[PDB]
Amino acid sequence: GSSGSSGEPARIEEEELTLTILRQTGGLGISIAGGKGSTPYKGDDEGIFISRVSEEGPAARAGVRVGDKLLEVNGVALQGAEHHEAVEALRGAGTAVQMRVWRESGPSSG
Known about the structure:
Belongs to the LAP (LRR and PDZ) protein family. It comes from Homo sapiens (Human). This is Protein scribble homolog. Residues 18-104 form the PDZ domain. It is found in: Cell membrane; Cell junction; Cell junction, Adherens junction; Cell projection, Lamellipodium. By secondary structure, the chain is α+β, with helices and mostly antiparallel strands. It is built from 2 helices and 6 strands; from the N terminus they run E-E-E-H-E-E-H-E. A hairpin with a 2-residue loop joins strand 4 and strand 5 (76-77). The chain is globular. The termini are far apart.
C-alpha cells in the first residue's frame, strides 16, 4: 500500500474576518468587553472581544459571534483600544457598519 510520507506542518491561529452590519436605528445589537484599563475578556488579552450578540439584532444578521476579537470598526483600529475608544468607534458609524473581527476558520472548542 502506502506509508506516511507527506508532512508540511501548518500553523493554526485565528484569522481576520470582516462583517457588515446595518444601522436603521440607534446602534447595533452586540456587546463588547475588555479594552485597555479594564479586565480582559479572554485570558490576558487586552483586546476588545464580543461579550454578547443580540439574537434578534443587526449584528446577528451580519453573522457576528460572541468571543470575536474586534480588530477594526468602520476602518477604525480597535487594537488594544480602551473601552471608550471602542464604544466611541461603535458610535461612529452610519447605516452600513463594517467590523473586522478575528476568529479561526471554523468553530473552536465551543
